[PDB]
Amino acid sequence: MSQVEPGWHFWLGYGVDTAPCNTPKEKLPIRAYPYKFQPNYTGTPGAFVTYNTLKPKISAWEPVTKQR
Amino acid sequence: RPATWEESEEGALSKATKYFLLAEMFRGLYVVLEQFFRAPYTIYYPFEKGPVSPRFR
Numbered sequence: 001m002s003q004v005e006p007g008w009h010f011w012l013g014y015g016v017d018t019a020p021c022n023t024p025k026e027k028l029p030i031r032a033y034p035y036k037f038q039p040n041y042t043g044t045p046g047a048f049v050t051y052n053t054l055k056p057k058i059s060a061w062e063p064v065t066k067q068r
Numbered sequence: 069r070p071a072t073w074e075e076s077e078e079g080a081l082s083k084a085t086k087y088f089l090l091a092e093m094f095r096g097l098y099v100v101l102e103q104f105f106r107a108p109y110t111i112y113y114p115f116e117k118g119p120v121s122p123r124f125r
């Protein structure tokens with residue numbers, strides 16, 4: 001069920017009447033980037049990895065010495 | 069007051085024919101026999117999805 005395109009997925013489940021080639025220019029959302037469609041990669045090695053979006057909250061000191 | 073056996077409109081023969089010939093058992097049998105001959109409800113899931121409202125989450 002993961003291999004169906006999003007605009008078609010709402011149609012197969014009886015959400016919309018008009019199929020996504022039948023809908024006019026006004027409903028197609030404006031984008032500034034390409035579309036690529038990853039279905040689901042569960043068990044596949046292309047499974048998602050979560051991580052920290054930001055850096056550790058408290059900085060540590062860069063060691064700087066001084067000969068007196 | 070609940071009726072005794074003697075103040076009943078059914079005869080003993082009429083009442084016990086329904087007893088030994090299982091009348092309403094056969095009626096309830098014939099119900100599901102009627103249901104053998106009708107259309108099932110099953111949809112085939114990855115080929116056919118069920119309901120969607122846009123409110124769904």
Ligand SMILES: CCCCCCCCCCCCCCCCCC(=O)OC[C@H](COP(=O)(O)OCCN)OC(=O)CCCCCCCCCCCCCCCCC
Nearest residue numbers: 080081082083084085086087088089090091093094097098
């Ligand atoms: C006046 C008539 C004729 C006079 C001649 C005397 C008899 C001749 C006819 C004999 C044929 C007898 C057939 C079996 C008799 C069953 C009698 C009966 O109903 O058992 C009663 C018994 C409990 O008795 P009780 O506590 O008094 O409560 C009864 C509610 N009134 O209830 C029980 O304990 C359970 C009842 C079980 C019934 C069977 C349930 C499962 C089997 C269903 C078989 C259906 C077959 C259909 C197949 C179709 C095939 C095309």
